[PDB]
Amino acid sequence: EAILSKKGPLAKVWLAAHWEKKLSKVQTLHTSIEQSVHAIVTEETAPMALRLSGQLMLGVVRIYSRKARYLLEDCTEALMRLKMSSQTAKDSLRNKWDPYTEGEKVSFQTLSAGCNREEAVQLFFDVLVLATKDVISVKQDVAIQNEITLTA
Template sequence: MFYSQYILTRRGPLSRIWLAAHMQNKLTKTMVFSIDLVKACEKIIAPEAPMALRLTSNLLLGVVRVYLRKAKYLLSDCSDAVSRIKLAFKISTVICSPRKQHLYWLLHFAAFFTES
């Protein structure tokens, strides 16, 4: 082995990154958001002990997969928020007689046109 075995142990600093590279179905949403990608990239770029190139490439694949998952979660949260905002401010049409519509318009919008 061309790396310190502590790196990939269950509680190691890059264990979840390695898990994302090889078994991405086992990652939960809480696990994805608990991963600090900046620290993980720093540990991959400047490791404490030398690492094999193949291990480094697998870890970088894990970083990309975690980043992809975070982006997907952000996109789904944003689209959900946009749809809720659109639903909250949806203009409902009220069916009433033309006279009532005219009175409503006079009450709410006539002040804008009479102030000169």
């Protein structure tokens, strides 16, 4: 719960890792390590992931370093001090029995706009999709123009 409140030392080390090295003086530096390790080793807060564990590891090692440095400084001082439509087309074809060519399936389909343009091209795209999924076997290379036979 270290993100929410300031109870556990996990919150303090989280602040140390999250914000910066500062805003944690000597008087609040002297915290615990074993508690922090046994708090990170168990399952973390509301985000169940690993990223927060990585940040916490950075924080604990930074605190470790700073405390060791302070100990070094004190020891140096102590030394100094002691030194002293695809359906609509599928339906028309589903009904009509084999054999049937394209010209005739077009003949029984009249698009609402009356143009032998969009009706025909939509009919064509349609028979393409139908042939694309196992409806019709077709044949056109017999050197006869517009001679596609269409059969289930």
